[model samples]
Target: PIFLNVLEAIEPGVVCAGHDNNQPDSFAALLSSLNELGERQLVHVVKWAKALPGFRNLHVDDQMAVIQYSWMGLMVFAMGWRSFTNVNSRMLYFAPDLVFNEYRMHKSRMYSQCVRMRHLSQEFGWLQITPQEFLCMKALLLFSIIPVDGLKNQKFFDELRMNYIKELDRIIACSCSRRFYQLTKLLDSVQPIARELYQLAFDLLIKSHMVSVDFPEMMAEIISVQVPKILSGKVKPIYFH
Candidate 1:
């Protein structure tokens, strides 16, 4: 109960994509819009991370490293929630201003990923997930990925990670209709959706010079730096399944 209180207390508020809905869409325009939304989300993620219980117990560098490493997946979780709550999983509700239709999904060259995310949203309703469960799992996402070589404070990170997992179990215990296995399965689904986005973002960024797709300076930097580690298998997301 105490742990769940903290997770809920620090939950982030609504975020919008500042996208212009009037313009007709193109691959370049669609992707850049998603990029811009991602940039806006990153600023919020940093603040949210700092407020997570025991998150600052992590070594300072590792704190930033883990957030950058896991940002895409975190966004996917919230995006799936938005998609579910707003549109009933009928379409990818990426933002109030930038919802994705079938055309936008294909134009963004992310048809496959969009399908998976839509399915992920469907699972939320299927499992009848509570907001508390969602917040607990979202916080758990921050602890899910790390370098294979481990962080500077590997033991501290491990300790914090274990406690959060226990907190997740506690949360599930408080709400007994759902089993831990079911939740872990849902958690496992998040990484692949994020992975595909990573692939799309990587290609777009490398070719941003020749295209109109715009990445924020911070977004471009992480895609250049931390993303490769995940892409190359240097950093691996921890999985429960």
Candidate 2:
């Protein structure tokens, strides 16, 4: 507490946490807010970082660092994907049976869609590939011209949801990148537009329900309004500054 006060006395705006000359009681609240913001920014950066060449081609260990450090990014990705699924449910006209079978059958090709994906991938349990890679595979299968199950029940949809979430968490939390840093590379490459597509994807997935109520709208609102802003700046050497 003394240290914080001393620092705050010496540097005003720089005192983002702990004691402060201006806002004495703002320490804990600011600290939490800052943490939340840092987590979100890290998530955003890691999402882009994964696409960096070194990171993209890194082994799984490197991928874990990128994702774990960027928790907010993972959450954002999850929400965006959810939104995408809602769009896909309604927007795309593809058949579900074909989509399901594509995944069930051509698991390998589906697992690795492009060299970029392979470079930035680790392992996905379902296809024994990375999350990003699996998504490509999953997308191909998802967009295939076949009827999908769970047309009416969220439970059936949830079955697929759990598998995807498991893989996503594994990619974000697991130290293994297979070869692809799922969060960073994918986000870097596509974060700006991924959410847009996510909305579309979900529309197609949900089909009729998308019209009844918008999953993407709710998601967008959360992304914009629910996000926190942390105080960020170089603190400098405590005694000197």
Candidate 3:
């Protein structure tokens, strides 16, 4: 109960993309808005991670490293939860002001990635993931990716990761029907969806100047640095079957 209470307590509230929905859903407009949304969400995630149980136990560098690495997964997973809760899984709830309808998804030029995330929202409805699980899953996700060799302090990172897992098991056991494997399966699926988005964002970055797509300064830095590591196999995701 204590862990769950804290998990629930530290949860961040809703954030919008500050997107001007009235603007035509031009490819550049939508992608820039999403980049702004990414920058906005990144700040909140930094604070949330520090407050997360067992998070501060790691080396400070590792803390930032994990946040840098797992941000896409966190965004997609939370977006998945938001889409399911707000729209019943019919669209991408990228943010309150930037929901992706079918046309926008196509315009974004990442239709498959968009559709796969929507499918994740559908899974939330069908599986009936609780709010606690949502929060727990999000916390665990911060620990789910890393350099293959490990973090600055791999031992503490390993310990913290285990504790988060235990917290998850404890949380799952409290519910009526224990769906541990089923739930973890859904979390595993998030990694693929995350990498897909990363690829498109990276592609967009490569052509950003010519195409009029804008990447916020901070978003550009992380995508340039940490995001490349994952793509180049310098860092990798941890998946459970």
Candidate 4:
């Protein structure tokens, strides 16, 4: 995280926040900004996921399989999670299939976001985080930040959200399948960031469920174990501080 007292000192009223202290656009600067996140060890987890049997050798067919398998978990998680987030309102409509299709579309976008985030990491390093990972960490340290009941502050995420909805609508209009419509509706009214982050949370939940691991526990393991391995002997501990 970029931090500075450009505006004031001893409790500065103004601050500069962005990637690193240097001018933006430099890869090194971006990497510096994500330095703390890198310390958290998630990059390694991402790398591992990238290397997993299902994720590796990602032919077009393989990619579809991963997306579909991942979406299955995302859908279930969305159903329960949205209900959990908004207790009074319900996502269940008469057409369950339609709802699932929408969720599939949402999950598809998340899958794309996941891929983009990884690619950016490969290109930009830790400074930039994939939307899901960003949401996951945000959820992890929610108490430290203000209450983000929805993903309101995620940058330019509304564009992606709108695109997902549009595509989902297109899917429903053409599919003649009501199942898909109902699923997409699971996230119809949510703020884009909330939708994205919630989907991420759900995605993680489903992945954990598939492997029979607790979400928080598995995340902890990633942070504690896998993260260390990435940083081990790669950079000096002194540099981190």
Candidate with top TM-score is 3
User: What's the lDDT for residue 68 in model 1?
Assistant: 94
Ranking, TM-score, top scorer first: 3, 1, 4, 2
Per-residue lDDT tens digits for candidate 2, residues 71-179, read: 3333333333432343332121111111112232132122222222222221122224443533432221221111122123334333543443344454445445533
lDDT of 3 by residue, 1-241 (tens): 8888887887888898999988898999999999999999999999999998788899999999999999999989999998998988888998889999999999988788888988999998898888988889889999999999889899999888898888888888774334888888988999999998898888889999998998999899999988999999999998977
Task: Enumerate residue pairs that collide in model 3.
Answer: none
**Clashing pairs counted in every model:** 0, 54, 0, 18
lDDT string, candidate 1, 27-135, tens digits: 8788888888899989999999999889899899999999999999999999899899999997988888889988888888788888999999998999998998898
Report how far off residue 223 is in candidate 4 (Å).
10
What lDDT tens digits, residue by residue, belong to model 4 across residues 116-136?
222322321222322332232
TM-scores, all candidates, are 0.96, 0.20, 0.97, 0.21
**Superposed model 2: Cα runs more than 4 Å off:** 1-25, 66-241
Candidate scoring better on lDDT of 2 and 4: 2
Arrange candidates by lDDT, highest first: which order?
Answer: 3, 1, 2, 4
